[PDB]
Amino acid sequence: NQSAIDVVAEKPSVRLTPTMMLYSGDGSHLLKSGRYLQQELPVRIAHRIKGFRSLPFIIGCNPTILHVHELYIRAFQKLTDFPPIKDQADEAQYCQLVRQLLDDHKDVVTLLAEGLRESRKHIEDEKLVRYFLDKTLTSRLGIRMLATHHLALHEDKPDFVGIICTRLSPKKIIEKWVDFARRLCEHKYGNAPRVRINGHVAARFPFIPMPLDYILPELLKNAMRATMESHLDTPYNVPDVVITIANNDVDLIIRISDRGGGIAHKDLDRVMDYHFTTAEGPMHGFGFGLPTSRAYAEYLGGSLQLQSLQGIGTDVYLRLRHID
Numbered sequence: 001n002q003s004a005i006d007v008v009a010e011k012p013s014v015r016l017t018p019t020m021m022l023y024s025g026d027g028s029h030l031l032k033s034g035r036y037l038q039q040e041l042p043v044r045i046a047h048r049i050k051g052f053r054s055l056p057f058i059i060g061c062n063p064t065i066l067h068v069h070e071l072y073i074r075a076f077q078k079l080t081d082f083p084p085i086k087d088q089a090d091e092a093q094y095c096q097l098v099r100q101l102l103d104d105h106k107d108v109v110t111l112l113a114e115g116l117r118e119s120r121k122h123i124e125d126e127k128l129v130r131y132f133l134d135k136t137l138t139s140r141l142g143i144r145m146l147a148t149h150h151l152a153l154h155e156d157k158p159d160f161v162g163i164i165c166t167r168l169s170p171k172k173i174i175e176k177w178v179d180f181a182r183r184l185c186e187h188k189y190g191n192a193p194r195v196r197i198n199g200h201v202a203a204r205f206p207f208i209p210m211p212l213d214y215i216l217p218e219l220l221k222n223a224m225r226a227t228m229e230s231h232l233d234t235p236y237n238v239p240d241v242v243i244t245i246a247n248n249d250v251d252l253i254i255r256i257s258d259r260g261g262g263i264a265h266k267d268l269d270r271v272m273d274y275h276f277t278t279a280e281g282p283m284h285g286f287g288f289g290l291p292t293s294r295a296y297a298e299y300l301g302g303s304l305q306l307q308s309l310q311g312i313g314t315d316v317y318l319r320l321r322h323i324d
């Protein structure tokens, strides 16, 4: 029961708008944002410690959940022991602590879901697991974006202001993951569906690619796997996966349409649950794909919607909010 955690457990988070972040693209500005990072990170960690303290006693007593709760406390202690930033030199000392804590250990997400699974006999709230894991995933993504962005503001990459790409092409980032997915699918079945990309193929806009690097390969794997399992009798003649890009002033829509047989009526109300799967930080398998991708899409101001045509295929709509 530590009092420093209690002091910031209810303190509202301060999130800089990506628009404001793009404007800071800078010695006097890096000092101001570095001071902000130092003071924000313990508040984000204390919110998650408060989450562990609020679990029902029997669940919070799981040795895996308890071990993860201790990891959060130890991280809070390391981030608060560091003295307040006064100059550019103090700002640069804090970046190095941030890097060592970001690349730290365990694979917390994996341990948490394991602990929650071991405690399922004591879980009465049908939504407790889904809510705890959504909050854990979006909070850790928020922490990652906060820390990785500030570190990247010191480095100079073309077309980037920190982790924000100023000229992101959805077609290029989709193509990058299509090639990765097709190689894995080809190795497994001896073939892979071809992926066509249509719509606003020349669209380019400011966006943060990091969450797409989890979402796109997962959805592509889902569509390609469903197509192959659906056409096992003709494995060398399978229908294409068709991706459409729609770009407007409000959002970017990526529709991924397959002919993989659809998501059955009996599984539809389970596909968005953690651990639900029909296959034989956040993980890519074990039923994490869809709930993680949806939590990420909604955290970023968009959504992940599914339309199942049982017997034919599925259309998956990823919508993401524009920055300006």
Ligand SMILES: CCCCC(=O)N(Cc1ccc(-c2ccccc2-c2nn[nH]n2)cc1)[C@H](C(=O)O)C(C)C
Residues within 6 Å of the ligand: 014, 015, 016, 017, 018, 021, 141, 142, 143, 145, 146, 149, 163, 208, 299, 300, 301, 321, 322, 323
């Ligand atoms: C209409 C504005 C849409 C902007 C948006 O996507 N929003 C969430 C968000 C904000 C900030 C980040 C972020 C980006 C880079 C580096 C760190 C952070 C961050 N994340 N957590 N702390 N810092 C990510 C998502 C909204 C907001 O909050 O402005 C909400 C209202 C939908």
Ligand SMILES: CCCCC(=O)N(Cc1ccc(-c2ccccc2-c2nn[nH]n2)cc1)[C@H](C(=O)O)C(C)C
Residues within 6 Å of the ligand: 041, 045, 071, 072, 075, 076, 097, 098, 099, 101, 102, 103, 104, 105, 108, 109, 137, 140, 141, 143, 144, 147, 281, 282
């Ligand atoms: C300055 C870091 C403060 C936060 C911190 O120290 N930690 C959370 C954390 C760590 C790593 C990531 C991360 C980094 C790279 C790639 C993926 C992820 C990730 N991981 N999950 N989603 N994204 C995010 C958050 C602890 C830990 O987890 O080590 C805990 C014990 C407080």
Ligand SMILES: Nc1ncnc2c1ncn2[C@@H]1O[C@H](COP(=O)(O)OP(=O)(O)O)[C@@H](O)[C@H]1O
Residues within 6 Å of the ligand: 218, 222, 223, 226, 258, 260, 261, 262, 263, 267, 271, 276, 277, 278, 279, 284, 285, 286, 287, 288, 289, 290, 291, 313, 314
């Ligand atoms: N495009 C799709 N077509 C058919 N079934 C799908 C599709 N996308 C997802 N599914 C179903 O939803 C389940 C859960 O998906 P997901 O959360 O990504 O986990 P995983 O990929 O680890 O199985 C899949 O195992 C599969 O049964």
